[PDB]
Amino acid sequence: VFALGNNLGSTDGYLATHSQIATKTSKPLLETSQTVSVITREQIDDTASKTVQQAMRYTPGIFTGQVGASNRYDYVVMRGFADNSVDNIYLDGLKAMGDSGTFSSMQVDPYFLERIDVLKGPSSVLYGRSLPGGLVALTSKKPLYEDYRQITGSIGNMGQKEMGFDFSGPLDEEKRIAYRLIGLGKGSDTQFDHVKEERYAIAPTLAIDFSDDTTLTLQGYLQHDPNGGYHGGVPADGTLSHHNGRHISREFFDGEPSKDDFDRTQRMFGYQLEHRIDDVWSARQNFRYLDSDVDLSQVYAYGWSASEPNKLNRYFSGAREHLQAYIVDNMLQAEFATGAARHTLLTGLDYQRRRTVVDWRSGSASALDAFNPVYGDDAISYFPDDNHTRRLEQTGVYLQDLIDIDQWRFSLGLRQDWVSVTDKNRSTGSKADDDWEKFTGRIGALYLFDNGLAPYVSYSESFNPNAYSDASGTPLAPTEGKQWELGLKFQAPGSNSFYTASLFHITQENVASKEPQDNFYTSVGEVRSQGLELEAHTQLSDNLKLLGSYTYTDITYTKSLDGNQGHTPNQAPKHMASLWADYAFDAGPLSGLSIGGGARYVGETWADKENTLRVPDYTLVDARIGYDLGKLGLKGLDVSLNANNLLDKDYVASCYSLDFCYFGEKRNVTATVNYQF
Ligand SMILES: O=C1CCC(=O)N(O)CCCCCNC(=O)CCC(=O)N(O)CCCCCN1
Ligand SMILES: O=C1CCC(=O)N(O)CCCCCNC(=O)CCC(=O)N(O)CCCCCN1
Ligand SMILES: O=C1CCC(=O)N(O)CCCCCNC(=O)CCC(=O)N(O)CCCCCN1
Ligand SMILES: [Fe+3]
Known about the structure:
It is built from three helices and 38 strands. The longest helix has 6 residues, at 41-46. It folds into two domains: 1-143, no CATH class; 144-677, no CATH class. A hairpin with a 2-residue loop joins strand 1 (11-12) and strand 2. It starts with 10 loop residues before the first strand and ends with a strand. By secondary structure, the chain is mainly beta. Belongs to the TonB-dependent receptor family. Its main location: membrane. It is found in: Cell outer membrane.
């Protein structure tokens, strides 16, 4: 059993029935007064999904183009909140613990994942520090109690190759002890000249039942990315328009092949202890330690040379980083009745402690011709080194009551947080030391009709430490999100279909803002995001699987000192939609064959905060072919072929500014072989 900290749903095709993302305790999606999406293991594979970021490319309210084709980090823009989008990821109930103010942001390979859960809007009441768009919860693969052995191989264009294996099963005659061990190797060239991606990772897991009342799960995850692909951008001039009559290629490398390194070693171990006391009382401890090394050498373009017609000015960034982080979550849940009301009452205490030691170097590099470049002129003019030790501590105390009474489903949550953040400029010897406490709350109400219709309303709050500091060097007040949400959910009790609509209004406060004149920030900015999401998961037969989505997002700087009080953030499409279908032939000559694909639409986005032109809209097509050769008498063998961006469209996915625009991925074609023993 054991609802606390577990999804416990069911899954069929692309549709999950339950999640714990919104509650830290298993709850049907239909009875949860929040917007929750679930991306199934099957959805990841069918779409040939290569990262967490890309796996959401079919999910409403999520923009997946912040840095275009780059795969170095998972940038998850939620409900138009692009800033700190790298810090939205949770793994097995615990904040991932990257430091978004450094290069040490972690990435979880999808091959280790069983599910991806997406919670929209402010959600600090259960998690502490987080962004106003929502958050993403990855659920790792766990030991199975029956033997499972899979081997997979993939090959593609762009020099892609990959190997994985996934073995699981019980170790004891009684099936109280089970393991899973997963490993993988991969490599890629990318559309971009002279770039490599490469990764090696292994994940051991051990599960032990001390009895029916107690389970301990032991986890390891060790990952080495000796190369980091491409993580650059080029000027809008001449990507979005011609530059002296020519266009920059989508394969252009703005760096120096002799000085382009990204080495990230991420080492994690942890455990989850599950103890049932009573049919009433349950307790859980989730724990994870992280230790990572990141090494970076990057020459990048930054604007056009003022003197040399078709050359870009270039600069150099260098970094060596060591990140350490501890996270524990202590949960105690009471399940009990009080007359007609059934209560699910949760109390928790969590603790985050992080230290990041960063030695940064920078300088000026030679200009580079943006059309027919000559590489090799790699001398750097160094700027002053900039060395820091960064520390963060977060202690949270939270309370939640899920109250079900007749057809009502209510949610009440409160959390008090103590945050301490410090930054020792180790070059200068100075230290910024700041302590804060924040109170956050959430209240939800949903009415469940007996046909599977569920209207609901939600109010929810969030906070995040401010990345900026004021006229005295003291960091500003944490930013704050507040959200009103209205929704409607529908599942016909027969069907394997599910439909939702969500209407949202998010206000974000204490955003840093200053007049262009000034060098100092004040916490007087405000941002508002409002809109509508529609999501459809259908099975119209036991062969035909559907997904669809529509997103309308109106985000605006409602208060700014910098001239921008009235503008729309860049990297924030007003309109998005997507649709994916998969058809499996199940009897007859074609049996064992599967066919699939889909299309996703992103509306225009602004290239800059100043709003001076648009990044055009784009429509991409995906397609798939699978064949289970077991149907030809070799059981456990299946093969598939995938193509994303099937029409090979050449587009800018987005721009962070007028200097930095990113290309979308060209067609990515994959062939996969899966064999179970
Ligand atoms: O370590 C760093 C920041 C991290 C970074 O920049 N990465 O690229 C790594 C990925 C983490 C976040 C994704 N990027 C952003 O959120 C854009 C940040 C931005 O606007 N800047 O100007 C840069 C910040 C100035 C200091 C530069 N040094
Ligand atoms: O140069 C720095 C510090 C180094 C750094 O932060 N790097 O990422 C490495 C080099 C950036 C190259 C372009 N990177 C992108 O366009 C992705 C977004 C991003 O990462 N930014 O930092 C946005 C601003 C980058 C310019 C200002 N800051
Ligand atoms: O304002 C700051 C700190 C805030 C920050 O880092 N932002 O990104 C603010 C978001 C608006 C700017 C969008 N992007 C760019 O201008 C490109 C690279 C970048 O991001 N820079 O900051 C380098 C610009 C120098 C600005 C001075 N430093
Ligand atoms: Fe950067």
